[PDB]
Amino acid sequence: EQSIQLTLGPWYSNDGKYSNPTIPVYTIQKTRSDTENMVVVVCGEGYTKSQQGKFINDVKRLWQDAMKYEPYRSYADRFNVYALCTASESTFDNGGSTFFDVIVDKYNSPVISNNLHGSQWKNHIFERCIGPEFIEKIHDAHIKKKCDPNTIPSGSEYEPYYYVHDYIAQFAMVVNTKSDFGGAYNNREYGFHYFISPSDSYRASKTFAHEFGHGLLGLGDEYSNGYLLDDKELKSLNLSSVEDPEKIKWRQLLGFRNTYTCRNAYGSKMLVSSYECIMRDTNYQFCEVCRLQGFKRMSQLVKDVDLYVATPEVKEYTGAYSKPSDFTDLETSSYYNYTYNRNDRLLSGNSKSRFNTNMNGKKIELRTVIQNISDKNARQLKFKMWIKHSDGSVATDSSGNPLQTVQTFDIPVWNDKANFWPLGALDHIKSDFNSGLKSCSLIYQIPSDAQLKSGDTVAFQVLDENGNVLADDNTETQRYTTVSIQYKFEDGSEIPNTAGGTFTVPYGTKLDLTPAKTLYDYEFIKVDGLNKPIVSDGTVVTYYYKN
């Protein structure tokens, strides 16, 4: 079957338990060449050889649950996901020898323990052993190994393995356990880019998405502490200590959805853009700043994503939370007072029906934020907003003029792009949060003589230069559909060492990806199910490869 073979000398397996392991490789998802997608490699800790089927199903479960969160969900079909069936002598719960020597320290942190058996480089195993074998043999780039990982290179111990984390976007280690923990190890200068999370804890999927947010998306722990120094302020994608709303990096997002800067705990000098974010508390979704920053980060790792359009909202425009001085109080009470006010004004998503015939003479606001991913093409997006009767017709005033307004917004280029986690970067140092970023507000005065009827709602569209609808008043609550991937030989047999996963897309989506020319050594033949609206759960897209 498909596998990689490692050579682990005493620096990686000092007790000889894994001196020459054979590691079966399973493809969970490969929708395009590895050279065009983000490659995720997932290994199991504490799974015996007879438990590798549990491991594969565990990865599929955690991965599919991660793909339900924005911003990952927008990129769901642009990941290639591989499960490496690393076999431990002992299960994790039995407490004997495991592949990765993971221990849970006194702070409940899962840690690769170099000193457990004296394997002095154990926590370098991903970039020095697993990664380079994978990239030479499985990855479509087939980059030949450059250094013997069981010898000391001339010069830097680390530089020869930097290339690993450009071909493998993320290493994840799933522990076969119910224990609730999580850890992320992000220090590319010293080779570290992996996270560790449990298979069966009560919030295992939430933890996975969270540690994935640290690792791939570059997001900071919103539960952390302290006053950020100037260099750390520039460095952080989603944390701040800047109290002045006119200077805070994410000022353009203030007042959009639940973006209202606030202290992450009473008295804290550490500020978050939203109190309700998975990066502070794993029960939440990603906040709008994390969604933006993660969407930008992933755009650096693929080639064909050029625009981010946050989901627009419509709010009664009262003047509240409309200027910087409305955001100066950073207490949690101010955050929740802001979110209550938003709910009292909301006219979109699940509050569409709050529109009523008393809205004549009132102002409404269409609000979103837009990020240009291009550093070459400025963009011009047209917003349209109108009052729609329940039968779909456009409402009018008493003179017959449609209750409709339009405004075009100019989105400047992302000239700062090369400073924001580009391919090859060892870290993020400084970026201009506002480069390529435009908060867009379209305010409409509903006429006093508006001919409103019961059941009227606000409709809207964000349009590109060709009139294509990028978002509309149905986007937020639209139905998502599950699509299943299968890999088959031309005779219909399932390809061994594949375990095709599922993800979700908006109902009606036409998938349009160029399939990879090869799967392992199998040659691509044809695909069934692409370029066709996905309109049923369990829809199967079938990739056919020559045996």
Ligand SMILES: [Pr+3]
């Ligand atoms: Pr052959």
Ligand SMILES: [Zn+2]
């Ligand atoms: Zn955490």
Ligand SMILES: [Zn+2]
């Ligand atoms: Zn966040």
